[PDB]
Amino acid sequence: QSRSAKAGLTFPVGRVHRLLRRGNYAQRIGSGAPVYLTAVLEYLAAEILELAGNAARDNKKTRIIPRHLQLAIRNDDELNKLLGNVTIAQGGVLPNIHQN
Amino acid sequence: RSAKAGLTFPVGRVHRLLRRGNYAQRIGSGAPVYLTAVLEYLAAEILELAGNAARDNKKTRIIPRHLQLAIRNDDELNKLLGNVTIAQGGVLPNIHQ
Amino acid sequence: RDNIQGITKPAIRRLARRGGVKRISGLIYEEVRAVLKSFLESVIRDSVTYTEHAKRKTVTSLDVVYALKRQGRTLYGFGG
Amino acid sequence: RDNIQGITKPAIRRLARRGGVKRISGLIYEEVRAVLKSFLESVIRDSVTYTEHAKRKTVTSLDVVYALKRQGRTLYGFGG
Amino acid sequence: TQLKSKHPCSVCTRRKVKCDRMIPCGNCRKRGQDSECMKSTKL
Amino acid sequence: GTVALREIRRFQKSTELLIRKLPFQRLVREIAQDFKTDLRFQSSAIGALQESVEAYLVSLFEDTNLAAIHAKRVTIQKKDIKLARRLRGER
Amino acid sequence: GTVALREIRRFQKSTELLIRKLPFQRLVREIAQDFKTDLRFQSSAIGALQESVEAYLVSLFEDTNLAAIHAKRVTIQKKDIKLARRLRGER
Amino acid sequence: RKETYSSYIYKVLKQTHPDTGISQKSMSILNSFVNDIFERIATEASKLAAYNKKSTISAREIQTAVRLILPGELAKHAVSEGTRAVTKYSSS
Amino acid sequence: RKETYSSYIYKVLKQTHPDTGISQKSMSILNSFVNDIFERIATEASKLAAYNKKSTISAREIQTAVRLILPGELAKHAVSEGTRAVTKYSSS
DNA sequence: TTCTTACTATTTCTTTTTTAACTTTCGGAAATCAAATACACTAATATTAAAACGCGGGGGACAGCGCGTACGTGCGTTTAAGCGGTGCTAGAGCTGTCTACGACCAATTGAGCGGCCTCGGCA
DNA sequence: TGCCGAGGCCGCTCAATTGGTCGTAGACAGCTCTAGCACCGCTTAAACGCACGTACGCGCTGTCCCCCGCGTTTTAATATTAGTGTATTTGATTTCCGAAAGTTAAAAAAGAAATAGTAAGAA
Ligand SMILES: [Zn+2]
Ligand SMILES: [Zn+2]
């Protein structure tokens, strides 16, 4: 049985454990660490994807464009706080009008 | 090797030391010598700039305030050492009118 | 009387003197207490994490320097 | 007519519109040309270094992203 | 459980992957191989 | 001031490359030519610069805008840009 | 304003720890106590905090000073501190 | 060849919004983002591993690194998801 | 034990200012600074080495890394000092 | 004059080819248990520098008011972007192989380190 | 000026070095070919000067508010000593995953097996 089915996940732990050996991070890789990391990567990918789906749903659009990701990542904090220095390609700026 | 290149900094210590970091698969030959030369030059530069202030404040023992005068002057070095902090360093003397 | 008011207004005025100012408000002391407290939470959370991970029940200076390295700030003189 | 004046005042005004301003000076365009040129030297020096080290005589986008990583800035979408 | 040896069985002296400290050991209780561990230290 | 606020949000929606690409390309080729090699580029690397360029420029625009609004005026002078860059680190 | 400029340079020479160390120590022990462990410290780690603390505080002081000088006044209000921290990243 | 995450990502997106479509450039965006977070966490874990004189990278170190790279309750809701899958994997 | 650079540093300082004295805390300051620059350059060299699919770290890669970590003419006066000692070492 | 008829993609059945998974070996890492050892922290005073903390007072902040320079602002053009090919030759990939080069495994140390001391040079 | 420092002292133990293997690089050599850049040559949308006024930055004056004076208490301070009871670090010991061996499969392409159109030839 494959390790991802043996754990109940979708991102390939077989790729993850293979990259860490070729990543020269330390001498040995403890078994259990790559599936633990794969769980967090599988969590965050769907976490941002749900906010991107909600952004496409309020504009009645059946195709995710990078503006949706930009708006989602800038709207709520603790993700914008995490990605505090990134700029998405063709993303644009939040709608903001100040008291002039 | 330090005598074999005229350096005051230990080449073999560095060559052992970067091997103890898993920085790559293999370590080349002249690279620890290259590091030793760079570190020696940088130490010489900062000791020049420190000893200037050390003489100019009529002092013999270099105290870290005389060091922060040296760090905060060379614009290439102060640009390189922008985000640093030094205990008992002091401040740059600069005010407005 | 908690210790956030242990930071005296003369001490803030004194650091303001080293800061480079002569006129300040009285609202300044409470504002700067809030800012400084936010800074200390955002650093000692990382320091306590580094202390807890190594299963050591006391914090030393290398933990402090390692924590400050995350902020984008480096402190020499104590090892790091 | 060099290319630093190729950055037109309507383009700066247009980005200023996306910036969030309505009144600007005429000194702004020359000042922002100087700032932008300083930014481009400080990035393409690193990019040309990355291109020169790998003994490749052309610059690609991974070189750009790797150079921008030094600035403390990350760009997705092109690989990195 | 009888946490009393905490010591490897003879199968573990051949194949030291871990020791379960079971009857006769759970290291010995995978491949259906009681016979080596009743021919062992055997409490 | 007939048009100042109905258009400031018009291009906040139209996310595109705003700096026109050809003089940008010639500028970057010239300042690359100021370095030693006669060094060509991937075509994608021009846009890979251009989005980062516009991101930096928009960031400094917004920062000096908020500085000038604190300065109790609605106009930006280069005095505020020098402030905004000087407080932000680099110079 | 009898004393404003002959003393502003007096403590620019006397590099010491300016924040008095005991209430600083009690404050840091209390906010460590707000985290779970009853966790003691190395004595040197208190000063290791304190120099970084004073460095950050002096940096923000100087930054909001230069902001307020741009604001065409000589007094600092918390409006300028909020500006200086907001333009600098964190909030 | 290209080491994309596209099949994995496209099968993830059907879990919540099974009708929404995706862009190839957008696919590149979050693929690069995933590689970024992976490099960040692995590099952080390596530094603390070489700090405590350890030669291996267990999930304890990853638990520390995810708790420091991810902020606040995003970390606290990634720790639980992280520690769930390892125990499901172990009891299999 | 303590892996100081103190003997090396103290013998360097006699080259230019043979009368000036040093502080132990100041010794710690520039020793930590030296370790900082060493870690910065070595980490940068490692990243570009793993970028170009190379397994070894020659002095070519160090020449690139010193040219990017050090700014401007400080780099240009460190490259020449760097490339001098290797040729003196080779012809020995 | 559409009843047919073998093309004809086509589209789905079935298999090969591209990796990941299940066992042994075991070495060197890692956890454990116990002892030695360091040490961080309470607690007595003893100042004593230092924070409040007043009642002046002045100087800066701040608001209102002219004003006029100096910004937007259509209007009418000119000028290039830019799109659309051509196109041809430059570097990028991309294998074939191999001389050299570091990893490493032992000997062989001396040199860069604790630890006193003897001496008095810097604040 | 003195008192506590700061180099300058010796013993020494462990890393630096020296010398061979040898496994496997990356380094040239010779491709195939994009592909990028040069160029013409169209549009047509956008930059650019022009009068055009209102604002709004700015300077001036008045106000009045609040922030810093320095005497004067008043309260918490470093700074000592000692205990001292915890945590901490070694250190054998012991247990034990980690790698590495690969040989069941498997991934999705590949070819074929209908197969549902599919162009032509007479009522
Ligand atoms: Zn057993
Ligand atoms: Zn057994």
Numbering used by the authors:
A (entry chain G): 17 to 116
B (entry chain C): 19 to 115
C (entry chain F), D (entry chain B): 24 to 103
E (entry chain M): 6 to 48
F (entry chain A), G (entry chain E): 45 to 135
H (entry chain H), I (entry chain D): 37 to 128
Provide the authors' original text about this structure.
In contrast, budding yeast chromosomes have point centromeres with single nucleosomes that are defined by conserved ~125 nucleotide segments, including three centromere determining elements (CDEs): CDEI (8 bp), CDEII (~80–90 bp, and AT-rich), and CDEIII (~25 bp). In budding yeast, the centromere CBF3 complex guides the deposition of CENP-A, an H3 variant, to form the centromeric nucleosome in a DNA sequence-dependent manner. Here, we determine the structures of the centromeric nucleosome containing the native CEN3 DNA and the CBF3core bound to the canonical nucleosome containing an engineered CEN3 DNA.
To stabilize the nucleosome, we engineered a hybrid DNA, CEN3-601, by using the CDEIII and its neighboring regions to substitute the corresponding region in the 601 DNA. In the CBF3core–nucleosome complex, CBF3core bound to the nucleosome through specific recognition of the CCG motif by the Gal4 domain in one of the two Cep3 subunits. The CBF3core specifically recognizes the nucleosomal CCG motif through the Gal4 domain while allosterically altering the DNA conformation. The CDEIIIR DNA region associated with H2B in the free CEN3 CENP-ACse4 nucleosome was detached, and the full CDEIIIR DNA was in the naked form. The CDEIIIR site that interacts with the L1 loop and the α1 helix of core histone H2B in the free nucleosome is ~15 bp away from the GCC motif site. This structural feature suggests that the Gal4 domain binding to the CCG motif could have an allosteric inhibitory effect on the binding of the DNA by H2B. Alignment of the structures of the CBF3core–nucleosomeCEN3-601 and (CBF3)2–DNA complex on the Gal4 domain reveals steric clashes of Ndc10 with the nucleosome core, which explains the dissociation of Ndc10 from the CBF3core bound to the nucleosomeCEN3-601 and Ndc10 binds to CBF3core weakly.
